[PDB]
Amino acid sequence: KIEEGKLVIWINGDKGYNGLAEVGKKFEKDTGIKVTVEHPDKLEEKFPQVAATGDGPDIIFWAHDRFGGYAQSGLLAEITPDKAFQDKLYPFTWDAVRYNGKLIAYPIAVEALSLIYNKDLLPNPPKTWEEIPALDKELKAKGKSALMFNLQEPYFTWPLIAADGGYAFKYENGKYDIKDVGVDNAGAKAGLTFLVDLIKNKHMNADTDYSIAEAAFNKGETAMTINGPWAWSNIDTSKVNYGVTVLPTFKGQPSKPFVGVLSAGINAASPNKELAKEFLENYLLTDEGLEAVNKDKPLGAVALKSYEEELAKDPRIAATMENAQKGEIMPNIPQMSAFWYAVRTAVINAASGRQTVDAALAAAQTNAAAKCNTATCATQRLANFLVHSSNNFGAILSS
Amino acid sequence: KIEEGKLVIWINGDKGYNGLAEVGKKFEKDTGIKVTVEHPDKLEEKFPQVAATGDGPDIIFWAHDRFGGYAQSGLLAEITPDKAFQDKLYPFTWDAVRYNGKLIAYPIAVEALSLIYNKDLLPNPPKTWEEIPALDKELKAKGKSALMFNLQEPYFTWPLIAADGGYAFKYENGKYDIKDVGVDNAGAKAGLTFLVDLIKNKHMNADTDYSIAEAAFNKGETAMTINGPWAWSNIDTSKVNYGVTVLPTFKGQPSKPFVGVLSAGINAASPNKELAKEFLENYLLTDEGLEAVNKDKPLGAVALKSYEEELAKDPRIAATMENAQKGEIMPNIPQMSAFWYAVRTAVINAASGRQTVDAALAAAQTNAAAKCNTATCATQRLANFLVHSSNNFGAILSS
Ligand SMILES: OC[C@H]1O[C@H](O[C@H]2[C@H](O)[C@@H](O)[C@@H](O)O[C@@H]2CO)[C@H](O)[C@@H](O)[C@@H]1O
Ligand SMILES: OC[C@H]1O[C@H](O[C@H]2[C@H](O)[C@@H](O)[C@@H](O)O[C@@H]2CO)[C@H](O)[C@@H](O)[C@@H]1O
């Protein structure tokens, strides 16, 4: 099924897969082990479909939120980095890759969405969501729009939904209560209603996706976009004069983006687990390896202390971490797949006008929530506290 | 050594030891086992001395702060209640009696100090410490005084010392740094200076102890005192019309009392551990058992949910919990002994004029601070997070 003496890697197509392929080439040059990097469509859905019967890649990269589900299904090898290696990465990042108390992936970098704006069109970007409609009116008369971002993935709309009170699964006292979903409270309704009204009032199009928003911003047709570190390098090439800053407030509250830790897991069925460990620990998670990936598409705030110290002075990373501090770490519980699936459908149905905000979010609450909560082991409860600790996250924040 | 076929219990003399002896009589009726309740002076210092020689009581009652030291020293038997019993008490109270992964006592009640005032002498209690001098001046002209409280035990002066920034051990990210004490910072100096100034300006006396303050308040000789729930029954008998309220603010900041969980530990040297467990679970931690103790001297907010629901109606308990929310849970680390010794010494020396506030607190820092910072095991780091969770604690104060 999976080939012995070689490595296959899956990583998302928005990441620096060519940079990662360069790291694979250095690995092959030094060790003779071929590394093949692929970026399949819907890889986060395909992985569980293929790993169950011993197929799929040796190493899978994704934000940490999906890994709990994968671990629960028996798809991931427990990783065993030694103490000396663990000490090289920020503790917070290790805490984000624990499931049932075991380390189930190597953390790579911390991601959060920021407001990206065209400094020539918009020297003083808006501090609030409320002022965007008027900004869009002014710009439309000059042949431009105010804001375009991916409306097809709920990750991008979440910061606005969470701003005034929306939440996924209630986190409290080291545990996530899967009975208690906050996608249909007053805050979530207010946030999604604001988005839907932007669309009704012709300030945004319900069909806008990642590629459309990126092309619009990068060609100078829209003054702002919402995106993560990975997007910066294409903007660099476009020569649009851009800034990266704090997301706008809504009802006076900060936007609250979900925080992701890009992570690399090892397939439980891989016969190359030690080659995977060697590649990840000794090639990728080095200054040189991370630089290779980062130069392709920026990673955000990297888990490796030594390299983060170099990246810390970048204002764009400062903005990323400011937005992250205002947001919250994604849960990694197996119920996250159902949550994302339910919220994606609700946002698209409401933005399209097929459903009211209230009906869409009521359905999403029902479909995301479990009927009753379950047990959390002590080592995991500790991990949960640690990823909710500002002082723990602060080790990276100050860099 | 400890006598087999009998239970000796130690409890502090301010508590309901006669009520506890009544629970003992019921135990004796059912089991044939005589229960002797004693209330030795400075029992929290005597226990570790006598228990280290295999002597002492079968069961020791004290606030949870001293129990980490006792457990570390090997003086306490591990508690293993079954899930059915555990579910009867608030989780937070169990979390307070964990030490390095083991339950080392049965929790009984949550204690915090409050401001107690004579409503006939003082209908409107002061919101600030700063207004007490002027208040004392008016009352001295009427043959009374404003405030008397125990200045001999640092437990009672700590809320003022901590108000403007004083702290015991620096607490961050689930861990205490025992090298970093806050008994000699600007906030601690300000608080102790204010107390010492009250004495210098003849608004308080340095020799005022527990007995002097209680007698003066209950005989109507002074207008206010500072004390815990246990004191309310003697005030009831005195017929003084009293209120229990929030502690005064200092420099605009809440007074921060240390919160204690009265707990019952089993002596590791006891040959009666199974009897002691049965006494505690099946006789004391019942509605009827806690009622007997509480009717003698109030316990505070009890750990037993069924009885706390019955006591939550009392405004004096609400006040106790408001003060606790403003304060901090006591650490249970072994170094707490040295901390209390250090602050006890400083307050007495400053109040007597034996040393200046600065010199006393300089010595306290040296006496309280460890030479190095020990590790924190993962189990205790978790318990630390749990006892600092406002949602965890909130389950009680909602009652
Ligand atoms: O939209 C739901 C989606 O959100 C997150 O995915 C992000 C990912 O974390 C970023 O690295 C990036 O590639 O954009 C994605 C959104 O398109 C969750 O990680 C994911 O599981 C979820 O389905
Ligand atoms: O004053 C230092 C002393 O403070 C605490 O003791 C309290 C105790 O918690 C209450 O239950 C009560 O009886 O009043 C005591 C003060 O007299 C700490 O628990 C203790 O270890 C410390 O020595």
d(CA B236, CA B292): 17
Structure tokens at B313: 């109606």
DSSP category for residue A107 = E
A359: Cβ contacts below 8 Å, ≥ 6 apart = none
Instruction: Estimate the crossing angle of helix A336-352 against helix A186-200, to 10 degrees.
Output: 40
- Contacts with B325 (C-beta within 8 Å, 6 or more apart), sequence order: B390, B393, B397
Q: Which residue out of A152, A153, A225 has the highest number of ligand 1 atoms within 8 Å of its CB and is therefore the one to mutate?
A: A153
**CB A239, CB A220: distance < 8 Å:** no
Three-class DSSP labels, A154-213: HHHHHHHHHHCCCEEEEEECCEEEEEEEECCCHHHHHHHHHHHHHHHCCCCCCCCCHHHH
Single out the residue of A68, A73, A17 nearest to residue A49, CA to CA. Answer: A73
A299 in contact with ligand 1, CB cutoff 6 A: no
Considering only CB atoms, B389 lies closest to which of A173, A379, A382, namely: A173
| Amino acid at position B15, single letter | K
Least CB–CB distance from A385: residue in B172, B379, B385:
B385
In whole angstroms, what is the distance from residue A175 CA to residue A388 CA? 11
Exposure b/e, B137-176, CB count within 10 A at least 16 = b: eebeeeebbbbbbbbbbbbbbbbbbbbbbbbbbebebbbb
- The first and second tokens of residue B287, run together, are 């509605």
Beta bridge partners of A176: A171
Residues 6+ positions from B31 with CB-CB distance below 8 Å:
B275, B278
C-alpha span between B310 and B5 (Å, rounded): 35
Which segments of A201-331 does DSSP mark as H helices, in order? 210-218, 232-238, 273-278, 287-296, 305-311, 315-326
Rounded to whole angstroms, how far apart are CA atoms A16 and B200? 71
Distance CA B366, CA B183 (A): 10
| Token reading at B170 | 């620096």
Residues A191-223: b if buried by 16+ CB within 10 A, e if exposed: bbbbbbebbeeebbebebebebbbebbbeeebb
**Pairing state between β A35-38 and A7-10:** parallel
Q: Which residue has the tokens 């040295």?
A: B338
Contact A33/A5 with Cβ under 8 angstroms?
yes
Residue A217 to residues A15, A131, A207, B79, B380, Cα–Cα distance (Å): 19, 19, 16, 63, 50
Look at A381 and B378 and tell me if their CB atoms are within 8 Å: no
Structure tokens at A329: 């770490």
Instruction: Give B189's contacts (C-beta < 8 A, 6+ positions apart).
Output: B357, B358, B361
Q: Determine whether the shortest distance from the Cβ of A183 to ligand 1 is under 6 A.
A: no
Burial degree of A176 (CB within 10 A; 0-12, 13-18, 19+)? buried
* Residues in Cβ contact with B29 at an 8 Å cutoff, skipping those fewer than 6 apart: none
For B253-279, letters b (16+ CB in 10 Å) and e give ebbbbbbbbbbbbbbbbbebbebbbbb
Greatest Cα pair distance, chain B, in angstroms, is 61
**Closest residue of chain A to B387, computed from CA coordinates:** A173
Q: CA of B9: how far to CAs of A15, B23, B43, B333, in Å?
A: 66, 12, 11, 24
A106-111/A258-266 β-pairing: antiparallel
What are the residues whose beta carbons fall under 8 Å from the beta carbon of A373, sequence distance 6 or more?
A175, A177, A178, A179, A180
Q: Alpha helix (H) ranges present in B83-169? A: 83-86, 91-95, 132-140, 154-163
DSSP SS3 for B12:
coil
Q: What is the DSSP string of A352-367?
A: HTSS-HHHHHHHHHHH
d(CA B140, CA B145): 5
Q: How far is CA B89 from the centre of its chain?
A: 19
Homologous superfamily, domain A1-399: Periplasmic binding protein-like II (3.40.190.10)
Mapped onto helix, strand or coil, the DSSP state of residue B392 is: helix
State both tokens at A200: 């009704």
Residues A367 and A283: their CA atoms lie apart, in Å, by 42
Q: Are B149 and B227 in contact (CB under 8 A)?
A: yes
Mutation target among B172, B382, B388, B389 for the A interface, most CBs of A within 10 A? B382
Tell me how far apart the alpha carbons of residues A71 and B268 are, in angstroms, rounded to a whole number. 42
Dihedral of the CA atoms B192, A391, B67, B46 (nearest 10)? -30
| Distance, CA of B159 to CA of A86 (rounded, Å) | 41
Under a CB-based contact definition with an 8 Å cutoff, are residues B2 and B272 in contact?
yes
Closest residue in chain A to residue B395, using alpha carbons only: A173
**Cα-to-centroid distance, B65 and ligand 2 (Å):** 9
Whether residue A378 and residue B379 make contact (CB cut-off 8 A), yes or no, is yes
Amino acid letter, B342: A
Q: Find chain A residues with C-beta within 8 A of B391's C-beta.
A: 172-173
Distance CA B331, CA B276 (A): 26
| Cβ proximity of B293 and B61 under 8 Å | no
Task: Tell the residue nearest (CA) to atom 14 of ligand 2.
Answer: B155
- HSE toward the beta carbon, residue A390, CA cutoff 13 A: 5
Residue A141 buriedness (CB in 10 A; 0-12 / 13-18 / 19+): exposed
Q: What tokens appear for B356 in the block?
A: 């200046």
Name the experiment that determined this structure: X-ray
A173 closest CA partner among B382, B275, B284: B382
Residues of chain A contacting B174 with CB distance shorter than 8 Å: 382, 385-386, 389
Rg, Å, chain B Cα set: 21
Sign, CA dihedral B94-B99-B100-B102, equals negative
Instruction: Report which DSSP code applies to B116.
Output: E
A249: which DSSP letter? B
Q: Which residues lie across from B89 on neighbouring strands? A: B304
Closest atom of ligand 2 relative to the B14 alpha carbon:
13
Report in angstroms the alpha-carbon separations of A172 from A177, B143, B380, B390, B395.
Answer: 8, 53, 19, 9, 12
The residue with tokens 């915090």 is B112
Residue of B103, B171, B176, B385 to mutate, interface with A, max A Cβ within 10 Å: B385
Q: Which CATH class is domain B371-399?
A: special
Backbone angles phi, psi at A356, to 5 degrees: -75, 155
B364: its two tokens: 């306290």
Residue ranges of E strands in B39-154 = 59-63, 98-99, 102-103, 106-111, 114-118, 145-147
Looking from the CA of B60 toward its CB, the CA atoms found within 13 Å total: 32
Q: In A, what residues contact B, Cβ < 8 A?
A: 172-174, 378-379, 381-382, 385-386, 389, 391-392
- Residues A164 and A183: their CA atoms lie apart, in Å, by 11
Domains of chain B, by residue range, sit at 1-370, 371-399
Sign, CA torsion B267/B271/B273/B278: negative
Q: For residues B7 and B264, what is the distance between their CA atoms, to the nearest angstrom?
A: 13
Expressed in angstroms and rounded, the spacing between residue A155 Cα and the centre of ligand 1 is 6
Of A83, A10, A5, A14, residue with least CA distance to A296: A14
Question: Residue A320 and residue A81: Cα distance in Å, rounded?
Answer: 28
Question: Are the C-beta atoms of residues B360 and B350 closer than 8 Å to each other?
Answer: yes
Contacts of B180 in chain A (CB under 8 A): none
Breaks (C-N over 2.5 A) in chain A follow: none
Alpha-carbon B364 to chain mean position: 21
How far does chain A reach from its first CA to its final CA, in angstroms? 43
Contact B246, B95 (CB under 8 A): no
DSSP B206: T
User: Could you tell me if A47 and A73 are in contact, meaning their C-beta atoms sit under 8 angstroms apart?
Assistant: no
